Amino acid sequence: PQITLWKRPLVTIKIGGQLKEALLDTGADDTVIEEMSLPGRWKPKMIGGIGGFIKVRQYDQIIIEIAGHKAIGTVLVGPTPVNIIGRNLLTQIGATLNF
Amino acid sequence: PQITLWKRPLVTIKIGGQLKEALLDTGADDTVIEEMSLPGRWKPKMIGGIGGFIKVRQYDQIIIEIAGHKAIGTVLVGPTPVNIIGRNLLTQIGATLNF
Numbered sequence: 669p670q671i672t673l674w675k676r677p678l679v680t681i682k683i684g685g686q687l688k689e690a691l692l693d694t695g696a697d698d699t700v701i702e703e704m705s706l707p708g709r710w711k712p713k714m715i716g717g718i719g720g721f722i723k724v725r726q727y728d729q730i731i732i733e734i735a736g737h738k739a740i741g742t743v744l745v746g747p748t749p750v751n752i753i754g755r756n757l758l759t760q761i762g763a764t765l766n767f
Numbered sequence: 768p769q770i771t772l773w774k775r776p777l778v779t780i781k782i783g784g785q786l787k788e789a790l791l792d793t794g795a796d797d798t799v800i801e802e803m804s805l806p807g808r809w810k811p812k813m814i815g816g817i818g819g820f821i822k823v824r825q826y827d828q829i830i831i832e833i834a835g836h837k838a839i840g841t842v843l844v845g846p847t848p849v850n851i852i853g854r855n856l857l858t859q860i861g862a863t864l865n866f
């Protein structure tokens with residue numbers, strides 16, 4: 669679809685078989701999802717955002733659906749304030765910015 | 768224009784008589800620019816995201832050109848790690864996400 673930006677670009681995702689809401693976030697390199705139980709192997713990682721750095725669990729090669737579109741890639745799981753779909757998965761679904 | 772997301776979507780902006788590089792950020796409600804000496808009155812604000820909050824100065828009705836497109840609106844100034852163009856200004860330049 670084409671998504672305008674008057675409201676937050678929130679979409680439904682399916683991850684680990686569960687529905688969640690997430691923000692399509694062109695300003696994020698990575699995808700970061702709130703704490704959850706997720707099938708797959710992980711390793712500790714640190715990432716930074718506007719306010720500093722946090723600890724997350726890095727899961728590679730995770731199958732996820734974003735507004736109905738398939739991606740398989742890295743998902744970081746940790747205490748993010750909002751679920752964010754970053755460029756690593758936006759590129760997989762063919763998203764671009766247009767103006 | 769169309770901007771793909773393989774790399775950070777950085778564009779040139781003009782603000783306060785200076786050229787800067789900034790990130791087009793669909794995940795940002797607000798526009799946050801690196802410390803600069805903008806003229807006139809402002810209001811204290813705190814903004815947050817991953818990592819916590821930072822303190823910024825809120826300036827209203829700031830004239831800003833984004834990749835050649837004129838805009839006018841609120842700009843937050845402070846110790847951000849990257850200049851961020853958020854939805855308050857992305858809407859003014861008619862930006863969408865498309866997939």
Ligand SMILES: CC(C)[C@H](NC(=O)COc1ccccc1)C(=O)N[C@@H](Cc1ccccc1)[C@@H](O)[C@H](N)[C@H](O)Cc1ccccc1
Nearest residue numbers: 693695696717718749750792794795796814815816817848
């Ligand atoms: C800029 C902020 C006003 C923006 N936040 C928001 O727009 C809303 O912030 C909150 C905070 C708490 C609860 C609900 C909403 C934000 O952090 N936006 C981020 C996503 C986000 C995180 C947490 C909450 C909401 C959004 C990103 O789009 C962020 N601007 C990029 O990662 C830019 C970046 C790249 C590299 C280093 C540092 C920063």
